[PDB]
Amino acid sequence: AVQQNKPTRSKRGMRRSHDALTAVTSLSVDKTSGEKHLRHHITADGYYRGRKVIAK
């Protein structure tokens, strides 16, 4: 139910070896507006594949 000995700080680091997180490989560029955006997502301005989707 509970530990019998105190784990070491070395053992703590080993468990966290899989905790690192990854970053986006790259960002797409709109053909008309020109700004960066996440792939398969609309731009902040409101463009998608150079169509100017509703940007209310």
């Binding site: 690192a20 997180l21 970053a23 996440l38």
Partner: protein, 110 residues
Amino acid sequence: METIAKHRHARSSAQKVRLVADLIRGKKVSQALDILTYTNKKAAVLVKKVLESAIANAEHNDGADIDDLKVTKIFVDEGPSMKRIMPRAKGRADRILKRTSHITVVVSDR
């Protein structure tokens, strides 16, 4: 030459913030800003503001150029904790710790 910006007494544990900091260590400032923009973590917002402040200090005080800046050093340190009491069952009481941290960023032309 180096420029420094800091944010002390931030409401977040050092362990959580350190995860974001590892992403941008050694990267260029222009590339670093893009990475932080598309990271879905609370600590990403905090680190972003500190990085922007460091860049601004360069031109006004040191007269540097944006294109030549890159992140050379970055680390997080633990700060003071706050003590609180949380009631439990059977009349027992527990201690709650709210941790803070200090964030430092260094940008240089090297």
